[PDB]
Amino acid sequence: TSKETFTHYQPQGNSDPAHTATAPGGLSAKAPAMTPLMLDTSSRKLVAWDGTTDGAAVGILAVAADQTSTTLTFYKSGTFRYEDVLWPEAASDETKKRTAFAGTAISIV
């Protein structure tokens, strides 16, 4: 419990001391946590990963979310457990998902 601050709120500027991202939510259905997700380019929203799109995974959802989620809290980087991460069946090749975070600061094993 601690809230004390007052400054000219500005829509241009966002930074958190944590190592996670918080999107305004833009899913289309309910999805469990501990899984990779994809970030839109135009709508700039965070939605569950398709499973096919190569290099679509941008981060892993920390807490399960749904299309009704107004805010999604997913990771940004760090070594995560693949044996636990619930990858989408769409992934026909094991190497496909294992390399879904190609380009980001995320490294899964």
UniProtKB/Swiss-Prot annotation:
Chain positions covered by the region annotation Disordered: 1-27
GO biological process: viral DNA genome packaging
Cellular localization per UniProt: Virion; Host cytoplasm
Keywords: Capsid decoration protein, Capsid protein, Host cytoplasm, Late protein, Viral capsid assembly, Viral release from host cell, Virion
Pfam families named in the record: HDPD
Family annotation (Gene3D superfamilies): Head decoration protein D
Keyword Translocase: no
Record-stated family: Belongs to the lambda phage gpD family.
Name of the protein: Capsid decoration protein
Species the sequence originates in: Escherichia phage lambda (Bacteriophage lambda)
Gene: D
